[PDB]
């Protein structure tokens, strides 16, 4: 029986370029949402997003190497390096074979897709870059990282849209527990704040359109919600088999105890009002962790700020928690962070970890008027102190009715 633990964290987000800076901001209820400036937004109904401020990889990636990779890859590599370094793990010829990675993304390299496509339109296939494929495809973050570190263990990339972060972490853990690896860098990366990303989700009427106050747009469970907010970033965890960790005197953030998946079997871009899909994923994580819903101190909701999605998760929470529905704290950091799609579940797994270490839960900001008929503690406006919280649960849901949940335990 092999237990899995988190021994390293890395992160790039709209509120901080490091793990600690990001957590500090979240507990302080800060928003990382700002107006888009890197492309003309005149014709765009949505003109803001949660961007990564002052990104720098000069010391991690050569501009020679930078040319062969989309922003999403650069972000993921940086965050993955941060995590590898934070873990203290030393790759040796003994090790190599037993260390891998499970890193995905929702949409991948849109920015370079647009660039290459624009080039082809203007001057033919002759203008497409030799790096088109390798610089845009989803598995490129695991690709570069394995190379940078000489990792020869299993490497996979789960592209399950907005549910990727959770899936990659879940399966990385599965890969470890199963015996295929001893250590795994896992998580996701995304950079979809481009004409296509913004134009695309905007075309589906999925984005908040509150340009007059970009910072108040992400408002999960609030009566005035008008769609999700797009956020860029990457989040990475180094997962390791318990004994392998101890034996090397690794610092252990927390333990990965449960992982559950489910399918909505309902609609391509929406969940059922009843949240039956979300309920199953959560129900599966508990059964996997062998605990009861009553033991969860906090839930880092998927809470995207869409009219239909927020209601469904709330429904699902009432269903799984029932009695304790009022005693469990639920909050959506997307209220500050925005929605980082393929990286959401990753960064949000980190917040679920830190909430355990620091016995502090971050707030769902902008919750001025919650929906009516809801008995839930959405941790509105301000961070909240907690006492004997041993477990946290993290949800991620995605287009295609794909759901996943991770349960983390203190120590």
Ligand X SMILES: C[C@]12C[C@@]34CCC(=O)[C@@](C)(CCC(=O)Nc5c(O)ccc(C(=O)O)c5O)[C@@H]3[C@H](C[C@@H]1C4)O2
Find all residues with CB under 8 Å of 365, minimum gap 6, and list them: 29, 31, 218, 219, 335, 336, 380, 381
Q: Does 262 bind a second copy (CB under 8 A)?
A: yes
Cα–Cα distances (Å) from 334 to 17, 147, 181, 192, 220, in that order, read: 16, 32, 32, 15, 8
Using CB under 6 A, which residues numbered 152 to 191 contact ligand X?
162
Q: Contact with ligand X (CB under 6 A): which of 215, 269, 274, 359?
A: 269
Using CB under 8 A, which residues numbered 284 to 323 contact a second copy?
284
Q: Does 304 bind ligand X (CB under 6 A)?
A: yes
Site string for a second copy, 201-220 (x = CB under 8 A): xxxxx---------------
DSSP H or E segment with residue 139:
none
Q: Contact with ligand X (CB under 6 A): which of 253, 259, 397, 408?
A: 397
Task: Note whether 287 and 379 are within 8 A (CB).
Answer: no
Distance CA 199, CA 195 (A): 5
Q: Contact with a second copy (CB under 8 A): which of 47, 144, 210, 244?
A: 144
Q: Does 362 bind a second copy (CB under 8 A)?
A: no
Q: Does 227 bind ligand X (CB under 6 A)?
A: yes
Cα–Cα distances (Å) from 344 to 140, 168, 217, 301, 377, in that order, read: 18, 12, 17, 11, 22
Q: For the CB of residue 363, give the shortest distance to a second copy in the complex, in Å.
A: 29
Task: Note whether 407 and 291 are within 8 A (CB).
Answer: yes
Q: Which two tokens stand for residue 173?
A: 């853990």
Q: Which two tokens stand for residue 88?
A: 């203290």
Q: Does 219 bind ligand X (CB under 6 A)?
A: no
Please identify, using beta-carbon distances, which residue of 35 and 204 lies nearer to ligand X: 204
Q: Does 204 bind ligand X (CB under 6 A)?
A: yes
- How buried is residue 318: exposed, middle or buried, by Cβ count under 10 Å (0-12/13-18/19+)? middle
Give the single-character DSSP code of 371: P
Please identify, using beta-carbon distances, which residue of 23 and 259 lies nearer to a second copy: 259
Q: Does 23 bind ligand X (CB under 6 A)?
A: no
Region near ligand X per CB under 6 A, out of 57-65, 279-287, 291-299, 394-402 = 394-402
Q: Does 67 bind a second copy (CB under 8 A)?
A: no
Q: For the CB of residue 313, give the shortest distance to a second copy in the complex, in Å.
A: 17
Q: For the CB of residue 204, give the shortest distance to a second copy in the complex, in Å.
A: 5
270 binds, among a second copy, ligand X, none (CB under 5 to 8 A by kind): ligand X
Q: Which two tokens stand for residue 32?
A: 């990382």
228 binds, among a second copy, ligand X, none (CB under 5 to 8 A by kind): ligand X
Q: For the CB of residue 351, give the shortest distance to a second copy in the complex, in Å.
A: 23
Q: Which two tokens stand for residue 337?
A: 């962070």
107 binds, among ligand X, a second copy, none (CB under 5 to 8 A by kind): a second copy
Q: Which residues pair with 163 in a beta bridge?
A: none
Find all residues with CB under 8 Å of 56, minimum gap 6, and list them: 17
HSE-up of residue 102 (Cα within 13 Å, Cβ side): 27
95 binds, among ligand X, a second copy, none (CB under 5 to 8 A by kind): none
Q: Rule CB under 6 A: which residues touch ligand X?
A: 162, 204-206, 227-228, 269-271, 304, 306-309, 339, 397-399
């Amino acid at each position: 029986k092999r237990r899995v633990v988190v021994t390293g964290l890395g992160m790039l987000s709209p509120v901080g370029n490091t793990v600690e800076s990001t957590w500090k901001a979240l507990l302080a209820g800060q928003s990382g949402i700002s107006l888009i400036d890197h492309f003309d937004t005149s014709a765009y109904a949505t003109k803001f997003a949660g961007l990564v401020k002052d990104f720098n990889c000069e010391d991690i990636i050569s501009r020679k190497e930078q040319r062969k990779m989309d922003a999403f890859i650069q972000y993921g590599i940086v965050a993955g390096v941060q995590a590898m370094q934070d873990s203290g793990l030393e790759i040796t010829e003994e090790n190599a074979t037993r260390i891998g990675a499970a890193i995905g993304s929702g949409i991948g390299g849109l920015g370079l897709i647009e660039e290459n496509h624009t080039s082809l339109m203007n001057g033919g296939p002759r203008k497409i870059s030799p790096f088109f494929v390798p610089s845009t495809i989803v598995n490129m973050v695991a690709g570069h990282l394995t190379i940078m570190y000489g990792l020869r263990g299993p490497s996979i990339s789960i592209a399950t849209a907005q549910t990727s972060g959770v899936h990659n972490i879940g399966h990385a853990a599965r890969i470890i527990a199963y015996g295929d690896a001893d250590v795994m860098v896992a998580g996701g990366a995304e950079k979809a704040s481009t004409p296509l990303g913004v134009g695309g989700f905007g075309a589906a009427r999925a984005l908040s359109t509150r340009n007059d106050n970009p910072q108040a747009a992400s408002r999960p469970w609030d009566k005035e919600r008008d769609g999700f907010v797009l956020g860029d970033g990457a989040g990475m965890l180094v997962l390791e088999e318990y004994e392998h960790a101890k034996k090397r005197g690794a610092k252990i953030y927390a333990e990965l105890v449960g992982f559950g998946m489910s399918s909505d079997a309902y609609h391509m871009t929406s969940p059922p009002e009843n949240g039956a899909g979300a309920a199953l994923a959560m129900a599966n994580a508990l059964r996997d962790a062998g605990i009861e819903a009553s033991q969860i101190g906090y839930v880092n909701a998927h809470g995207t700020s869409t009219p239909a999605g927020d209601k469904a998760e709330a429904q699902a929470v009432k269903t799984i928690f029932g009695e304790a529905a009022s005693r469990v704290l639920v909050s959506s950091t997307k209220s500050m962070t925005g929605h980082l799609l393929g990286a959401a579940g990753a960064v949000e797994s980190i917040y679920s970890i830190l909430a355990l270490r620091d016995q502090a839960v971050p707030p769902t900001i902008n919750l001025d008027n919650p929906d009516e008929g809801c008995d839930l503690d959405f941790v509105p406006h301000e961070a909240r102190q907690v006492s004997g919280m041993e477990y946290t649960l993290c949800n991620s849901f995605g287009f295609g009715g794909t759901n996943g949940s991770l349960i983390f335990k203190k120590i």
